[PDB]
Amino acid sequence: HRIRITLTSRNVKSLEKVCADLIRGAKEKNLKVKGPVRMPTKTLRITTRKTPCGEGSKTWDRFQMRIHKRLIDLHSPSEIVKQITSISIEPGVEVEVTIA
């Protein structure tokens, strides 16, 4: 019963907590599990000038966006995960639940 809670997020320190919760509450029912397997972070990037024309010296703004991923791997029934997931998440992160 391989199940994969793949967490994608923009937040470094709300993610941390939502992946913790899933592992705090797996070992009380106690159903054996893999550990937090990360992925390589992406910085998208856009650059632009600052002005509404072409006047002045040419200065440059540089807008980033670090986009941060986790994943954790369960051996458990999917009805057991209906309970688990819906219990307590937060706005910073959205959760996927790969079933097999």
Binding site: T8, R10, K42, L44, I67
Partner: peptide, 19 residues
């Protein structure tokens, strides 16, 4: 949706919905 988009493309068309 049906055609299945990109996560970059997905996390950004989020931002433009909000604004």
């Amino acid at each position: 949706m049906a055609v299945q988009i990109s996560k970059k493309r997905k996390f950004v068309a989020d931002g433009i919905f909000k604004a």
